[PDB]
Design a protein around this ligand. Structure first.
Ligand code: CDL
Ligand code: CDL
Ligand code: CDL
Ligand code: CDL
Ligand code: HEA
Ligand code: HEA
Ligand code: PEE
Ligand code: PEE
Ligand code: PER
Ligand code: CU
Ligand code: K
Ligand code: ZN
Ligand code: ZN
Lengths: 107, 459, 186, 99, 121, 90, 180, 62, 91
């Protein structure tokens, strides 16, 4: 069963005595129904919808990396509402292993 | 275009749209039944038009099973998300997907047209001969609808099976749920077609299978060899939805994924070999009865494992998240409701208990709690979860605690009293009854009118 | 479960082993296109399905259910007097089917029927022995059980000698009462 | 009241929890490490220690079955013997018998 | 007991009260709940407790009612549904006075047993 | 293994469990043979199981029987309480 | 505070039922004459000519997008060289107030927390065993009762009288031996 | 964003509205089902028929 | 309804200046929802349904009184004999 990543005590040792757990808000913000402008036409309302996607949002950490909107299933990865053609570039499921080959390295 | 579209997601919307439309006719028939049963006497159907009631109950059952819940849970949600869950661009067979929905609509038009034009008589949704074969042409029309529906179901099953060849990710539990239902259809439908053809032969080709020296019990074997696999073809997609909703909304990874998957496979194999629990009162041999009773009780084991795995999904979830969303409430309500339906199923599984409870309203309440409450709520919960992806609006459902509470209370007012009258006893498929059963029938009728009123508040 | 492809997987010899499964798993697979990738995917599936403790419970249930199923089918064909596969008796009128009538009585008296019928007194309060006596002899004479059926029968005492009213509800005392009135023979 | 405080202090001392035997392979916290998280973390349910849970759960079980006995012996009553069954005349005719 | 015996890196509150605080709240207003139990304006942060000063990992707990009404609020500062009350105040009390906990649980179970047995019998 | 947590089977019998695929096959085969045997060895055997003079009387049967025998309860329990239909009306 | 008042100005109440004037006052069914809008109707919806009557998927207005070199226009990233390194600045979505309306202030705090997983493998395995075998025990507890009651119905009894019952539409015929 | 009917209902506390709505819907259902039977007086529910059934039950020991 | 200020088990932790923030109140207020008449009507409504759910409405009783007196007379005069407490019930 999965119980999280394994931690060695050495990795829990801080580099400063004042280090605490970063208090970054992971609430993306306040939202509601997407509100279109009357002036916008069909094309410009499409752009508006594409700019309100929660799955394109993320939270930036103190070191500049961002934790993205994540989901257990790929159903939450398409634009909402679903466009006619979704996964043009095949979504990549990344598997990890310990195998390596020499060609990838240089001395 | 509208009818020419091959987009798998558009077709999924069509399936839900058509299920709601046909569903209006289904609910109306249900209201007729409950109105009639409000007291003893004739209320809305004349004593000279009792054949109409027999037709109402027959069409109610057939439409809700084959034209509403099956197109909604096996055609609607599946055609919209399955290709996305499989990280594939679109469904494997685009043109077949288009014709399947068109076929469903055409078979629906045939059925309703037969109401208007043919004499109205009924033989139950189980079309038992010899009654089914001594009827009028409306029975012939209904047979054509079922055969046509069978074509759509099988080709759709072929479509989903081909996802195994193209799936680019992991087969999630929901995908496993649809694949196994597809397998159940591929193995059960061909048997149904054969027995339906024999019904036609006796109706239209002067065959003699269902007259003396021919065993009428033969039909019941072949029919129910498809019948019970059908009830699991209708519930398994609902189970798949429940798994996704609980994991997503609670932000918890599915526990015992492989046991969930192996529980679905197990239910299918067992569901393919227990059909004769519908034929307990015919007079089968003692050993046959004991075999079927034994295997029927076994189905509870895999079904029980899934229920408990769902419970732990909801346990321990963060309190800060708002739990009043309609999709979450419906998913939780499914566990509470399905246990009631399943337990009563185990009660009726004991054949000696079944002698008293066969062809009584206890059976009605049993399969209503699972389908009319559990399956409906599961389809609603699934659509509600995909509201943003689907994009529909102009309804007040997403956060409506009044609708959920009123629905739960009133739906139980309808069918809980039907368990009581099962030991009274009130037979099924009847319209008139003794005056001492009015109280419970009246209470259930009050429940039916109330549920309909609550369906108007969503708009 | 090893995590390095260099470390081999142990396999027994036979028709259901790790080697047997590897040979056939990727027959229809478009994803196992080279040795490294094929082995990785093979071990991924084996780890997920065969190293999952709860999965073995379902293996037991399918075996038990299937074994019962195969046997009940076979038993009907081999022993049930009403199932005909040979035709000799079906080419004769009913009074002449002696070979098929031979299956009748042996099939009418299975072991479990004799073992469990005495336990009807755990389901019937009045005259649980109403059908025990039969002078013909096709079946054995029945004697009521001395103990309740094991399990969920807490409503009745564990042993019937403990029950005060058991003897007075017997078909014998009831027959005595009614025979004293001239009401009925049984 | 003196006995009350005595038994209360006796129970309390015995129930004080001992460190859990972790059934999971976690590291040892570095020495001298204080509070690092905050109270806005998702609440973690407050769970009774095993001994206390058994004590209260056992008191509950002893309570419900003693309550069942109290109802059976005081609130409820036993059936008196059934009335004597004397011979009574049946009605002369069925009300629906044709005349 | 998560803070007491399992995990020593989360802030541990002080119990202000082993009973919930009853307060009238209004929809559209935001309330701040004391998570340390040292505020003198319970159940709210007073501006002088640990939560107000952001000391030792204590922060005010934001809360907002959907509708107007009277709501129960946590005094033990450990309820699972904090700031709202769900019975954790009684549970935490039993941990601190296990002998008292048994008395109440026996009494509650005794009443439940009598009523359910009296009605069904 | 019957009614066995397979986690225990993996721990205490490592060599017997090394090939998990083969282990799964034995699980199926063993329970298949158990089901088959029940039908043809517990249910089918003809003209058997009718020895009602040999009803098993367990150690608990005798403990409770002797206790009641020692007192008068066993005699009182077996006594027929009523063997008449109508009471006599004074 | 009331967040609706922040974006009240953007929401001007409407004048027409369903947002369109009577077709007589303005014909929204016709294609727009504006240059570059030949594929749209006057009200902004796509014209039937563009989508149905002359749909490009049917062979109308054939115009291959790809050029001779097998290329299509692609917009590049926002590149910013700095500190002896070429960087790409990602596109951040606009403030949710612009798209949704509410002002992004006083947001409740939801901290980062890794997935809530069940631990203690040994304990979990035992529970899963119970999730399967507790029902199995119950079924086994019903099995013996089921056999007995089935055997009871199918018991060879010394019946002394026979009543034949035939069911017809719609009445029940009864045949009984007459006293001699 | 909602019509008047929902704005009115959604303003009240849920446990103030919910109980009233539950009773109201049930009452309306009964009212609807009573409109078609106003003044209907079957003879089998009269006191005379009620007594006759009691006589039948006594004779049949029902 | 100008609720009272309940100090609680530890009065020192309620001794600060609340200002605009609400002050703690007695628990009777929570049950009565500050004596809101509509919640009282809703409470009475909750009892009314639950009584209908389990035992029937019992609001029809005043209307059924005459027809329950006729049913009782018929059962006594012509119905099968009832013994002891059984005579209390009429069906
Ligand atoms: C002497 C004689 C000798 C011998 C002669 C022998 C001759 C042999 C001839 C053999 C061939 C004959 C047949 C030829 C068929 C040709 C097909 C073809 O190629 O068409 C291309 C042709 C392409 O058209 P086009 O020329 O490019 O332009 C079309 C227009 O621009 C429109 O553009 P569009 O296509 O985008 O618009 C379509 C769409 C536009 O959309 C809308 O109208 C609005 C949006 C939808 C509104 C909501 C509808 C309800 C929700 C439905 C959800 C499910 C939808 C599933 C998908 C659609 C299925 C139809 O609306 C519709 O037209 C239908 C919408 C759905 C209607 C049904 C909904 C359920 C109603 C239930 C009511 C009762 C309960 O197809 C069509 O567009 C029309 C096809 C029509 C087929 C009709 C078949 C009906 C069968 C009914 C049952 C029959 C039995 C009983 C009947 C009883 C009657 C009394
Ligand atoms: C007279 C009064 C006698 C009082 C005796 C108190 C004994 C006691 O509580 O010992 C705890 C005591 C721990 O004392 P502590 O100082 O609090 O130490 C705790 C440490 O932190 C760490 O301690 P640790 O690491 O050694 O682990 C101990 C912990 C480890 O805990 C665990 O690992 C969890 C154990 C529970 C798991 C349950 C799983 C159930 C799964 C169900 C799945 C199926 C559900 C669906 C079924 C569907 C069916 C259709 O044990 C527990 O939490 C045990 C909890 C109690 C289990 C009771 C099981 C049977 C039910 C009894 C109910 C109450 C009956 C009262 C009767 C009164 C008279 C009428 O243990 C020991 O001294 C050795 C162990
Ligand atoms: C001393 C007090 C108890 C007295 C009695 C004790 C009796 C002995 C019990 C055993 C020993 C108990 C020892 C406990 C010591 C404390 C241990 C501990 O850890 O303490 C802290 C711990 C909580 O600490 P915490 O987690 O830190 O947080 C504090 C919170 O308070 C968190 O609290 P919580 O989450 O633990 O809250 C408890 C809550 C947790 O559970 C829930 O809230 C779940 C509620 C889900 C409801 C879902 C909707 C259901 C609607 C169904 C409608 C169906 C209609 C149609 C039916 C058609 C039928 C044909 O429990 C309930 O609400 C009770 C649910 C019980 C099952 C409900 C179903 C009953 C069905 C009856 C038969 C029906 C037959 C017909 C139907 C068909 C049959 C096949 O306290 C407890 O464990 C308290 C447990 C209290 C149980 C009370 C049960 C009362 C209700 C009985 C059943 C109803 C009928 C009665 C007549
Ligand atoms: C009829 C007239 C209306 C009567 C209304 C009655 C409602 C009762 C159910 C309320 C919801 C229950 C629930 O799950 O609360 C979650 C709630 C968890 O936190 P929460 O944030 O307060 O609840 C949010 C809910 O969504 C709360 O739902 P909401 O969002 O609709 O907000 C309403 C709010 C405000 O509602 C009220 O003020 C309800 C006041 C009810 C007074 C009833 C008077 C008599 C009526 C007849 O309700 C609460 O604050 C929940 C209070 C639950 C306890 C009620 C009193 C029980 C007896 C003491 O659980 C509790 O506080 C109750 C746990 C009690 C212990 C259970 C285990 C005991 C085992 C040993 C025995
Ligand atoms: C989707 C719908 C659905 C589902 C899931 C089921 C599920 C089950 N049904 Fe079915 N049934 C119907 C729909 C359904 N049924 C319909 C529509 C009919 C009537 C058709 C007609 O006659 O016209 C019918 C009729 C029907 C009968 C006929 C009774 C009669 O004709 O008189 C019987 C009896 O064997 C039966 C049994 C069962 C059983 C044993 C299950 C099991 O699947 C239930 C399993 C679930 C549980 C057991 C609860 C969850 C598990 C646990 C909580 C574990 C613990 C429980 C135990 C250990 C027991 N059903
Ligand atoms: C899944 C199928 C289904 C569904 C939903 C229902 C729903 C209902 N049924 Fe059902 N019913 C059957 C299948 C179904 N029934 C069958 C198969 C029979 C036996 C047929 C026979 O005897 O021959 C039967 C029999 C039957 C009878 C027996 C009549 C008789 O034979 O004597 C009665 C009345 O007592 C009845 C009443 C109701 C009521 C009041 C509802 C519901 O109205 C209760 C209220 C619920 C709703 C109104 C919501 C329903 C909404 C939808 C279905 C749409 C969902 C669509 C989406 C979510 C997109 N039904
Ligand atoms: C290839 C070379 C040429 C072969 C030519 C073969 C020609 C004939 C083939 C006929 C069909 C196959 C069965 C042959 C059976 C031969 C022996 C025979 O006559 O058997 C009769 C006997 C009963 O005969 P009666 O005396 O009339 O009945 C008495 C009361 N019951 O019937 C049988 O045993 C045969 C019928 C059953 C065959 C299958 C075995 C039964 C069990 C089936 C289980 C199915 C479930 C799955 C099992 C999976 C594997 C365990
Ligand atoms: C550990 C498990 C075993 C414990 C001991 C069991 C045991 O010895 O039970 C004996 C006891 C008999 O004892 P007495 O009645 O006291 O004496 C006999 C008097 N004539 O046996 C029983 O109670 C019956 C046991 C029955 C087991 C049945 C197993 C399953 C059989 C097949 C079931 C049906 C399968 C499907 C249909 C098949 C149709 C062919
Ligand atoms: O049908 O179960
Ligand atoms: Cu079935
Ligand atoms: K009627
Ligand atoms: Zn504080
Ligand atoms: Zn608290």
């Amino acid at each position: 069963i999965y119980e999280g990543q394994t931690v060695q005590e050495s990795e829990l040792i801080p580099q400063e005595d004042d280090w605490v757990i970063e208090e970054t808000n992971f609430c993306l913000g306040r939202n509601c129904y997407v509100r279109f402008r009357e002036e916008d036409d069909l094309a410009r309302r499409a752009l508006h919808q594409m700019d309100s996607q929660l799955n394109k949002m993320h939270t930036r950490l103190r070191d500049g990396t961002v934790i993205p909107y994540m989901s257990f299933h790929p159903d939450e990865m398409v634009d909402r509402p679903a466009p006619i053609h979704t996964f043009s570039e095949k979504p990549l499921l990344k598997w990890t292993w310990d195998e390596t080959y020499e060609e990838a390295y240089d001395d | 275009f509208y009818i020419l579209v091959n987009n798998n997601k558009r077709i999924g919307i069509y399936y839900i749209k058509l299920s709601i439309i046909i569903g209006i006719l289904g609910i109306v028939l249900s209201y007729i039944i409950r109105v009639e049963l409000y007291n003893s006497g004739n209320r809305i159907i004349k004593y000279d038009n009792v054949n109409y009631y027999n037709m109402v109950i027959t069409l109610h059952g057939l439409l809700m099973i084959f034209y509403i819940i099956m197109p909604g849970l096996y055609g609607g949600i599946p055609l919209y998300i399955l290709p996305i869950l499989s990280v594939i661009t679109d469904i494997v067979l685009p043109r077949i997907n288009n014709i399947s929905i068109i076929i469903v609509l055409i078979s629906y038009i045939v059925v309703i047209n037969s109401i208007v034009i043919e004499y109205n008589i009924g033989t139950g949704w189980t079309l038992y001969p010899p009654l089914s074969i001594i009827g009028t042409v409306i029975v012939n029309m209904i047979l054509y609808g079922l055969i046509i529906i069978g074509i759509s179901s099988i080709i759709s099953a072929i479509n989903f099976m081909n996802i195994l060849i193209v799936i680019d990710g992991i087969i999630y539990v929901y995908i496993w749920s649809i694949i196994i239902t597809s397998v159940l259809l591929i193995i059960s439908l061909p048997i149904l077609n054969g027995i339906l053809l024999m019904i036609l032969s006796d109706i239209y080709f002067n065959s003699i299978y269902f007259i003396l020296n021919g065993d009428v019990v033969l039909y019941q074997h072949l029919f129910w060899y498809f019948g019970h696999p059908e009830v699991y073809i209708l519930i398994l997609p609902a189970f798949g939805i429940i798994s996704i909703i609980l994991s997503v909304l609670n932000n918890k990874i599915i526990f015992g994924m492989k046991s969930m998957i192996l529980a679905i496979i197990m239910i299918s194999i067992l569901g393919s070999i227990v059909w004769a629990h519908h034929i307990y009162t015919v007079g089968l041999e003692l050993d046959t009865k004991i075999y079927f009773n034994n295997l029927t009780l076994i189905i509870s084991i895999p079904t029980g494992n899934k229920i408990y795995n769902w419970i732990i999904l909801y346990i321990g979830s963060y309190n800060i998240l708002y739990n009043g969303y309609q999709s979450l409430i419906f998913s939780i309500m499914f566990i509470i409701i399905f246990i009631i339906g399943g337990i009563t199923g185990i009660i009726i599984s004991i054949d000696i208990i079944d002698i008293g409870l066969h062809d009584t309203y206890y059976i009605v309440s049993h399969f209503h709690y699972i389908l009319s409450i559990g399956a409906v709520i599961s389809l609603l919960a699934g659509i509600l979860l995909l509201k943003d992806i689907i994009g529909y609006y102009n309804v007040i459902i997403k956060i409506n605690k009044y609708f959920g509470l009123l629905l739960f209370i009133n739906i139980n007012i309808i069918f809980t009293p039907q368990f009581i009258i099962g030991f009274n006893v009130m037979p099924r498929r009847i319209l008139e009854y003794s005056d001492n059963i009015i109280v419970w029938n009246l209470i259930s009728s009050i429940g039916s009118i109330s549920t309909i009123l609550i369906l108007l508040s969503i708009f | 479960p090893p995590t390095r492809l260099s470390t081999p997987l142990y396999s027994e010899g036979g028709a259901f082993t790790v080697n047997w499964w590897r040979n056939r798993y990727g027959l229809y697979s478009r994803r196992q296109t080279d040795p490294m990738l094929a082995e990785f995917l093979f071990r991924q599936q084996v780890k997920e399905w065969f190293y999952d403790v709860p999965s073995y419970n379902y293996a037991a249930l399918v075996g038990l259910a299937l074994g019962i199923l195969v046997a009940v089918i076979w038993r009907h064909f081999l022993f049930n007097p009403d199932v005909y596969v040979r035709r000799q008796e079906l080419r004769k009128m009913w009074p002449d089917r002696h070979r098929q009538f031979a299956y009748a009585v042996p099939y009418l008296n299975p072991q479990l029927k004799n073992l469990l019928l005495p336990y009807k007194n755990s389901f019937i309060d009045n005259e649980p022995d109403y059908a025990d006596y039969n002078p013909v002899g096709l079946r054995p004479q029945r004697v009521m059980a001395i103990r309740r059926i094991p399990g969920f029968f807490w409503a009745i005492p564990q042993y019937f000698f403990e029950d005060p009213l058991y003897t007075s509800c017997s078909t014998k005392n009831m027959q005595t009462i009614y025979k004293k009135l001239g009401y009925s023979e049984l | 009241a003196a006995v009350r405080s005595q038994i209360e202090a006796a129970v309390y001392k015995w129930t004080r929890p001992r460190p859990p035997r972790l059934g999971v392979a976690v590291p040892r916290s570095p020495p001298g490490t204080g509070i690092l998280f905050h109270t806005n973390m998702q609440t973690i349910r407050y769970s009774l220690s095993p001994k206390v849970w058994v004590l209260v759960t056992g008191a509950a079980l002893v309570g419900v079955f003693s309550g069942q006995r109290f109802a059976q012996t005081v609130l409820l009553s036993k059936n008196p013997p059934n009335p004597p069954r004397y011979r009574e005349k049946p009605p002369v005719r069925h009300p629906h018998t044709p005349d | 007991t998560w803070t007491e015996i399992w995990w020593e890196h989360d802030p541990t509150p002080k119990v202000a009260q082993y009973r919930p605080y009853v307060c009238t709240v209004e929809s559209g207003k935001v309330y701040w709940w004391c998570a340390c139990g040292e505020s003198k304006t319970q159940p709210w942060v007073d501006g002088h407790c640990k939560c107000s000063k952001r000391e030792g990992g204590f922060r005010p707990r934001r809360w907002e009612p959907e509708h107007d009404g009277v709501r129960l609020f946590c005094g033990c500062k450990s309820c699972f549904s904090s700031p709202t009350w769900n019975g954790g105040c009684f549970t935490k009390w039993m941990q601190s006075n296990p002998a008292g906990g048994m008395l109440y649980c026996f009494a509650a179970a005794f009443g439940f047993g009598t009523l359910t047995v009296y009605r069904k019998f | 293994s019957i009614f066995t947590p397979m986690d225990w089977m993996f721990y205490y019998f490592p060599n017997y469990s090394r090939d998990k695929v083969a282990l799964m096959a034995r699980q199926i085969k063993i329970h298949f043979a158990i089901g088959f045997a029940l039908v043809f060895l517990v249910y089918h055997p003809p003209y058997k199981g009718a020895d009602y003079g040999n009803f098993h009387k367990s150690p608990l049967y005798w403990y409770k029987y002797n206790q009641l025998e020692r007192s008068g309860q066993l005699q009182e329990n077996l006594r027929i309480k009523r063997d008449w239909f109508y009471d006599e009306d004074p | 505070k009331s967040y609706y008042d922040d974006f009240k100005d953007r929401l001007k109440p409407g004048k027409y039922t369903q947002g369109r004037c009577p077709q007589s006052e303005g014909d929204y069914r016709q294609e727009s004459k504006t240059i570059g809008r030949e594929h749209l109707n006057d009200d902004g919806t796509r014209s039937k000519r563009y989508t149905v009557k002359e749909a490009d998927a049917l062979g109308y207005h054939y115009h291959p997008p790809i050029d001779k070199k097998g290329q299509v226009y692609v917009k590049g990233p926002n590149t910013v060289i700095e500190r002896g390194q070429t960087w790409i600045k990602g596109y951040e979505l606009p403030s949710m107030e612009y798209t949704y309306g509410p002002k992004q202030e006083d947001i409740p705090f939801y901290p980062r927390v890794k997935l809530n997983v069940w631990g203690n493998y040994n304990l979990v395995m035992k529970v899963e065993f119970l999730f399967f075998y507790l029902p199995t025990i119950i079924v086994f507890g019903i099995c013996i009762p089921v056999y007995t009651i089935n055997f009871a119905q199918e018991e060879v009894i010394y019946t002394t009288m026979t009543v034949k019952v035939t069911g017809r539409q719609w009445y029940w015929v009864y045949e009984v031996e007459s006293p001699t | 964003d909602f019509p008047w009917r929902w704005g009115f209902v959604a303003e009240k506390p849920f446990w103030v509205g919910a109980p009233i709505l539950v009773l109201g819907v049930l009452c309306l259902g009964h009212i609807i089902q009573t409109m078609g039977q106003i003044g209907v007086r079957p003879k089998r529910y009269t006191p005379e028929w009620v007594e006759a059934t009691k006589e039948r039950e006594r004779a049949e020991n029902t | 309804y100008t609720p009272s200020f309940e100090r609680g088990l530890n009065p020192e932790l309620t001794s600060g200046d609340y200002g605009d923030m609400p002050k703690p109140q007695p628990l009777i207020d929570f049950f009565t929802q500050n004596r809101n008449p509509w919640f009282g009507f809703a409470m009475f409504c909750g009892f009314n349904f639950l009584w209908w759910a389990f035992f029937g409405a019992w609001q029809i009783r005043p209307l059924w009184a005459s027809q329950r007196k006729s049913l009782a007379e018929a059962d006594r005069l012509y119905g099968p004999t009832k013994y002891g407490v059984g005579k209390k019930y009429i069906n």
